[PDB]
């Protein structure tokens, strides 16, 4: 059920707190607060 609470995961994200087991993981899921299709206010 869960989505994965097994495995080390050092790249945490510090936007929301998402850890990847892999480093361009967690890069491309901090794309979503870089900027996702504009400025969610709006
Ligand atoms: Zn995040």
Known sequence: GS???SGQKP???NECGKA?????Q???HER???GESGPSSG
């Open 26 to 28: 967690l890069i491309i």
């Open 11 to 13: 790249y945490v994200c």
């Open 20 to 24: 990847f087991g892999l480093k361009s």
């Open 3 to 5: 989505s994965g609470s």
């Open 32 to 34: 979503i607060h870089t």
